[PDB]
């Protein structure tokens, strides 16, 4: 079908233009002032509002397993939520059983997504163990399946955690495949010791989750991951930046040389972790994810500052909330609570409120950190995250003045609590368009189950590897 | 006129693609892999070489031995297809008269497109009205103020606050020459009384501390008023760090290292050869710390410094010999208009610090976004001006005073072996450099007018005005 | 007289030991466990409590008709654990320093309860100021002078005047003190804030942002590093200005910072109070930071050593004296309280939290100050031959600061309601018990002026070497 | 026996005072101007020269040249006490390696000494031996390792276990901070580039791997709330890590050694293999020649606190074992004799710090940290008679021909130092008097140290109450 957006302000990461936009066959066909349109073309009046590239959520965990349970938002309900929020593409993390085949787990995830997802999607593969025969499955995943990003774990002792030797092995190998190396960075050995100590103190409430994983343990694992990456000369991507001190580590490392990228998630940019000390156990357990929200209320603004000057580059969600019934498995033991929070619907609205409405960054920067930087990093740039002739027709009409108060009483998630409850945000989407067709307009949702396509990603993204290739020949 | 570039790797600041570039009528007309062009169309084979937008030198002092023709000629040889030259009036005289004088001399001599900075050497009565004329009528959106040169060009803190507020009202880019003029004065007296008269005394009267100080004062003023500030000629680690730290906090500060400070250091002031030492004399001075050119490049790579310039101001040995007995009398300027893109490439891309995309960003694209010239300049895209360089990353160039396109006897990058230089240069749809042959037209360059309120700078300012109040 | 403290834990900046202290004729005579002494001596049982040197407040403005005179202040200082203060002499711009110093000296010698020394504030760099500075140093015994970068066309010196003053004071071997705020920029913000329609005390904080302090501080350091002299930054009030100092200390320049009890204990959210009289009580220069995270941050820097001394900047004014600027914030008199609360606030923020130990507490309340200003080991040390200015400190004695209980006539206390975990029990000054079990036994005019010698070693030993080191020269060519 | 120093300017960490010092029975008995003394006393005129406390070298590896020639060299150098590292096999007992170290030193040492015990493996049964060492044997300092994979290296969990136990014992926890797991991989990477020379040592242990391990060591200690001590700070990048932590809270102490303060690692690239091998120590000397300057500044402002030497003497023949593989070259440099002289030259003569700070970083701070103050590191009545008369003008140029070591190469070769010891008194005996050496083998005493040094543990005690 065919569609035309008249009289808008097109925002890209590089510039802004007043021009009309014409979409046909799931692509942007023309951009200009006086356009030539063929057959049955529907017209949408933009009225001077911003025309931006639909968001790319780099970090989603829609079918994440934790404590024997699956996240409450599946691929259908998850991506339904994303679209309402202005997110037109996600990259979901595939989470294999430690020891199980990556291929088998990839097909399971692909099957579930292709039948339920409302929007285009890519997949990360989380390498949960460095087992014998893992290297051949990785090669197939890069060259045949179309996956260019793999996540390794420094936390979760004796479950997901890799040693310093194993990390070195895996960074080198993935570097050879030209993959983006994602890292969940928290010291798992110290966490294990601290959880043990806190429980034995009598502290069973969700606060103990935040006390057993203070920001220092994140700062350390982040620095350790950057050190390894700089030895090997490969790009390293830090997922779920939750702390001012981990962000400072990333910042300092970018001055020194190492190719490091940082990804705060909506949670860390929106709220803080003081809610762990809530008298309401249910509410407090809804905030539980790893790494935890910082109990320092000054973190959200500090992270947004770093996102503004370029030290943090992409935003995500880390969306994997559980239902109150699900979480209450850990009523007498915080380590038994399912880790995950919401963010997928709120991500662009939240980034906007903290970064643009406050004046820290402009609308051009907002586009980079919600979609464009993500596409450059993961090798999707011309296709996704740009309003250009030839690119996919994933567009959002954004109203910088439209008010929205985030509540669990109106959110498109299955869970009872929302970590941004009562946050009054100054800037919301009006119209969201996915794959050429309108999915959200005037508060009405028209999404199709299974309509999203899997987007394959080529190895060796130039944004990351162009500097790697040069540093290889300088080294020797 | 009609031109086609086959088999080149097109390099913008955002992505790189293998495609042909098709030029006609002063603009890029088409980009694609299999371009169907008329028979007989003049074709250039790039053969895997890089196709980058021609550089934009943001800091040039050509007008104040080498004329404006020779300057843009050397620019073009080095890959710079646009300059922004600084208008320098005597303090008290009309800005309009000095602008018109510059504009005339350039329009008849410039080989490449150009814009103009106007330096506000004095905040005299009646300067506000002239500034409105320069912005709305004359197409100038950038102005430099000085904090150095006591009793000559220097503006007090009260004056600077007034100037920044008024210039914020116009939507102008405020450039700053940041050194403490009052303290430099005291340091000049002390060094002269010590018997030091040679050019080494110019570096000791202007230590990096005094630079870092004025830079910080400049940012402080800008942060209070809520206006962007642009720091010209970043020469020192300490000043650079001030800028890198202020970016993180809030204020809208931009740094411009010049080729000189990226390529060489200031140990050459201590040479036994007076004529060699004197050639390095500029303000602010090259840091005597040899670790400076790497550090600066590192900040360019991460994003703390944004644009590169040259600070080009050619003086002959005879013209420099004026200060043979007093370093404060030595004319201030170095070379670099030609070497700029070659030096930046060698220090930042050849070493591995950054890639070819960020190279384009620091040599053209960022300057365009800042001074309101994008996407007209600094991008290879349909509709943009045909200012295109066929860059060869492996082509050897040795910088010398024998082969360079200037009448000055000494080069500050003398002996520097670079790996990556221009092969073919295209300005306004026409080939001006090819196979070592220069083919430039005297007076061919057009003046480019720049609107006020560059979106890159002022969109944040606009939002901040609503928030802070 | 003659006094013996037994069973106490003597705490100096360098170590802590269990011993008894024996005082005689205002000096410490013996320290040991089995002291052989006369058997008719007055004796105080400490019971394992801390015996620390009496504090030194390096920043007071008591002589500015006031609600509290020099006597009420020094009485309050003693009760709070402070046994010596260094007051600023504030002359008229253009007038004589010698004349104003004698006026301050006269009033102080007849009112002071405790020992005292005097800072001389150079309000103007007038023709013939150099001759009087030599006199104050060589004849009167003043080694510290404050210059102002703030207050345009009143106290402010230009960059050129500062360089001139710094070089001349270096030659004298004086401690250069600096009130660092950009005067010119404050003026511009003052005009703008008032035109906005803001007349309240909140406008004081808005016209003097923390970035304007930071700037002047960096400038002051930049000048001091070039001349090679020690610079002392009074009233460090902001995170940004404390960082400038921390950084400069690593680069070379001999810079010292002085946070006051105010900036370590409370913030400036109270400027935005509905109650005008309360908000006006907080008004001082530089202002308290609206950033509530500031007092902790500064205490951290005190504890790692980037800040060295604590003062109070005490300048007492009644609610009726403040009300001069009820319709204009710039006319409000600048001054807060803290001469009585200083050591209690510093302890509660620094030692009760675990940031520093009792030993560093001694360093930051007396010893460092003494070293800097050339009063060591006369003051700031419990050692044989040192002055008998002793305090018996109980690390667990609760004290709630209120306007009802404070030793002052002022209606408002900036530390109002703050609960503290460490107080003074016994305070001894010149060998006489001046505070015991709540009882205040002071003597008006008892306090001696202390002359301070030029060229204190703690600052100028490094200067004397760097002068000889000053390498790199013009080439012969 | 009995001794009197007149006309001298006593320099302590806190003040300087012109006064005379009287020594008797190995202690300092009187300090004053006109002292009443017995008749049979030797009088030394100081002539306005500096009278400072003898140095404390906190980092020596003499038994890993013997104990006698080292403490001789130390004495000559100004250092009147060293703290030597007891290094066991990961197949030997701490109790036995201790007594083997103790018996060797007590019969050879010229100056007073204390012992560190290096915990090379966290084995089952170690906790009992440690309780013996603290309570019965007089050791309050222990060093754990994060480098040397599968030999000395402890896992993070073992560090956690170890830091906790040691904190309960009231000890000083020393860390050798380099990442062993990454070093091993970088060794291979450099060997397969065909670099076998000593320069391969510097390249296989870049500073990033030290800074990482330091930061991880600090991070652990902050969770446990114990004081942590970083030995052999060799890099700006590690030194910054330490600097930044100090202002954030954690109780961290850093010990640059004379080598990293006085020279750099450009000498690994020397054409003469024997010389470059002589510079091989771990962590390596930084190839960055800005390092020694940077490190001395950090010593000046207070971010580094004590100076050691890491003195580990190997002859050229013993170094030759790794002529074809840098990984087999024994790690050790010299510095026990030079430590004070070098520190004076780089810190005091440059004007970064004054003589008072000089005493701090050469003795006093050490004494505070390891619980030897005010017995050591202070000229005061009752304190030990370990005095040095220091001449700030006396030239000492450093050469392998002149030094008191059987090694062929000196890492401070040809450094011209202004400022050196004139007289050196140890235990109230003159052992060095302007070139004239008179030491006695075995005269040095073992000095036991108590647990819970207040300099470190006063703040821990408080932080134990506040956190929970």
From Swiss-Prot, chain C:
Keyword set includes Oxidoreductase: no
Keywords: Cell projection, Cytoplasm, Cytoskeleton, Nitration, Phosphoprotein
PTM-bearing positions, type 3'-nitrotyrosine: 297
Gene coding for it: CRMP1
Record's function text: Necessary for signaling by class 3 semaphorins and subsequent remodeling of the cytoskeleton. Plays a role in axon guidance. During the axon guidance process, acts downstream of SEMA3A to promote FLNA dissociation from F-actin which results in the rearrangement of the actin cytoskeleton and the collapse of the growth cone. Involved in invasive growth and cell migration. May participate in cytokinesis.
Superkingdom in the source lineage: Eukaryota
Subunit record text: Homotetramer, and heterotetramer with DPYSL2, DPYSL3, DPYSL4 or DPYSL5. Interacts with PLXNA1. Interacts with FLNA (via calponin-homology (CH) domain 1 and filamin repeat 24); the interaction alters FLNA ternary structure and thus promotes FLNA dissociation from F-actin.
Modified positions (Phosphothreonine) in chain numbering: 82-83
The protein's name in its UniProt record: Dihydropyrimidinase-related protein 1
GO cellular component terms, semicolon-separated: actin cytoskeleton; centrosome; cytosol; dendrite; growth cone; midbody; perikaryon; postsynapse
